């Protein structure tokens, strides 16, 4: 009885991936108007985004992350990242300042990881000028809500150990745990990897 287990899990993922607007029931999360911001938030599949929006999101990711990727074991390759960001399974939360200028986004997916239904956050990226205003925390709280409303078991993400601000944001401010799949949770002599996998159960 091993296919029955993954079938219940994959059914829930497949259903979430057929949703229209995962935030339709939650209009209060479509605005963030604190600390000088006036943002409107939308949740769309990548197929619903304009090409210039995808370009902005890729460029913001590259600006913020390219050096940190090269400092890691992964490296940075434009094509690999663009293909990941434009996969048909990609979902986006996009924050538009004054409903007009894109200033932040998350790329997330409903997927199976280690036999569990999860919401995987593949990116959370803010322009520098909108940081330390609570917007990133709010976007992650939206992800947590969507994980609950679709019956996922956790929100998961990867963070570089050398991305010290993001590590403190997730681990301390948002109290994500180190996931059992993280490299640090294998081996009893302190292995050496440059990222951690973090998660927060629903």
């Amino acid at each position: 009885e091993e296919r029955a287990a993954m079938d219940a899990v994959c059914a829930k993922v497949d259903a979430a991936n057929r949703l229209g607007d995962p935030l339709e029931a939650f209009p209060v999360f479509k605005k963030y108007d604190r600390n000088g911001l006036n943002v409107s938030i939308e949740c769309k599949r990548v197929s619903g985004l304009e090409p210039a929006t995808v370009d902005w999101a890729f460029d913001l990711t590259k600006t913020n992350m390219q050096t940190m990727y090269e400092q890691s074991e992964w490296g940075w390759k434009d094509r690999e990242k663009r293909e990941e960001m434009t996969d048909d399974r990609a979902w986006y939360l996009i924050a538009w300042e004054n409903s007009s200028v894109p200033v932040a986004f998350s790329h997330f997916r409903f997927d199976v990881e280690c036999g569990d239904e999860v919401l995987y956050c593949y990116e959370v990226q803010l322009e520098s000028k909108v940081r330390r205003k609570g917007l990133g925390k709010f976007l992650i709280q939206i992800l947590q809500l969507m994980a609950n409303s679709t019956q996922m078991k956790k929100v998961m993400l990867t963070v570089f150990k050398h991305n010290h601000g993001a590590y403190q944001f997730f681990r301390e401010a948002l109290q994500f745990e180190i996931d059992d799949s993280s490299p640090s949770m294998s081996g009893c002599c302190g292995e050496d990897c440059s990222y951690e996998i973090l998660s927060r159960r629903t």
Partner: peptide, 5 residues
């Protein structure tokens, strides 16, 4: 960012 193993 990204999806590690």
């Amino acid at each position: 960012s990204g999806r590690g193993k």
